[PDB]
Amino acid sequence: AQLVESGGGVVQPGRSLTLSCAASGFTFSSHGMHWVRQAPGKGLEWVAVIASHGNVNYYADSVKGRFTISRDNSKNTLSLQMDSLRAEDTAVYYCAKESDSCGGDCSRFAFDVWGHGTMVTVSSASTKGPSVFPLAPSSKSTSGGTAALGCLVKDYFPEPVTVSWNSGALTSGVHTFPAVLQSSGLYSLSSVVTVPSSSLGTQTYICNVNHKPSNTKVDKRVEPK
């Protein structure tokens, strides 16, 4: 059985988004339904519940008065209307089905079917593509040792960016780091690779950066200065 989740997006603070889940392979109206979320750097947080026949609901204090949970036992869908959004509402949201009774030994207090998760991002930032700067290998790089080089992908919004090296031909020793959110509200990440210092004598290194929201495509060669 499945919960097929949709919705989500990127909005300004004080604005609204609606999330939805469609039931598949089970009797929707027979089960209580929940929303759960996970904010960056935090754990799972329960958000809201609506009873099987929509007659009782309940909210976490953190969202009470702002979010509205509802269900449609005709279309067999579950909704979360998220109004008055705050930056701290930024999170992956999951719909979840209450676990089944089983003739006495099983409770309805767990979550047995989960939606895949969808991202909600709340920020005053507006769409901006990144600047891409080289992280050139040290002049001290010398044969027999290991050299590091990379690209700094700075000041973009929203997530995500994708980075490859040499159009995907280079993967060994690559580390593309989780983006960090700057006080400016823009993201920044670095992508590096370590290679034999010897390889600087023969090999071209190009970082391929893509930020779809801004249609930004950059291919930057990284060489010793």
Partner: protein
């Protein structure tokens, strides 16, 4: 009103090693306690229902036990795909809200590996645009604990750096870390020596990487 406290914060297990995860409730919850496995980018996966009942398709190496306030999840021997964050969870009928523990990160334990350490001055290109980012890279180290401190003309920097750490490497079970120090171009030009001080248990002494602007 119900709080679930998980420990340890991180549980480090060699492949094949047995491990136990603890979840303690702030008051009795009977057997109303579930466990989920969660990996970045996918839905939480039910492991254990009602304290001890395995969820559909969950391998026998996962077992739940306990009642009242003290609960445990046992992994009889870590397999690589078991690396994940594990949460316990409670709910009752009324009031109906669920409570989650804070999570226990399960990671692969391996031998100590010291980081290789690299520093990158800002590019002339970035300087052209009025900002200066200095980057410090700690490459492929274990365990995850590391300290990076920035010094500018020997002055300890505070509040102007951010760092990021990769997920555990699928090949060698190490971590990598990037720290970025950010200054205005003006501020950057007012100093000469930029240094990254790295402390890790794999290093006999902290390593300092530096350059003259």
């Amino acid at each position: 009103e119900i709080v679930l406290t998980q420990s340890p914060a991180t549980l480090s297990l060699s492949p094949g090693e047995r491990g136990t995860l603890s979840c303690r409730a702030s008051q009795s919850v009977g057997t109303y306690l579930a466990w989920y496995q969660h990996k970045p980018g996918q839905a939480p996966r039910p492991l254990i229902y009602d304290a001890s009942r395995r969820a559909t398709g969950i391998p026998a190496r996962f077992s739940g036990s306990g009642s009242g306030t003290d609960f445990t999840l046992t992994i009889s021997g870590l397999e690589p795909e078991d690396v994940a964050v594990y949460y316990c969870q409670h709910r009752d009928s009324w009031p109906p809200g669920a409570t989650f523990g804070g999570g226990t990160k399960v990671e692969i334990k391996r031998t100590v590996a010291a980081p290789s350490v690299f520093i990158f001055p800002p590019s002339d290109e970035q300087l052209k645009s009025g900002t200066a980012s200095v980057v410090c890279l700690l490459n492929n180290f274990y365990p995850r604990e590391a300290k990076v401190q920035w010094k500018v003309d020997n002055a300890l920097q505070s509040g102007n750096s951010q760092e990021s750490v990769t997920e555990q490497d699928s090949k060698d079970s190490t971590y990598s870390l990037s720290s970025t120090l950010t200054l205005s171009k003006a501020d950057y030009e007012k100093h000469k020596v930029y240094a990254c001080e790295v402390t890790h248990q794999g290093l006999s002494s902290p390593v300092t990487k530096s350059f003259n602007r």
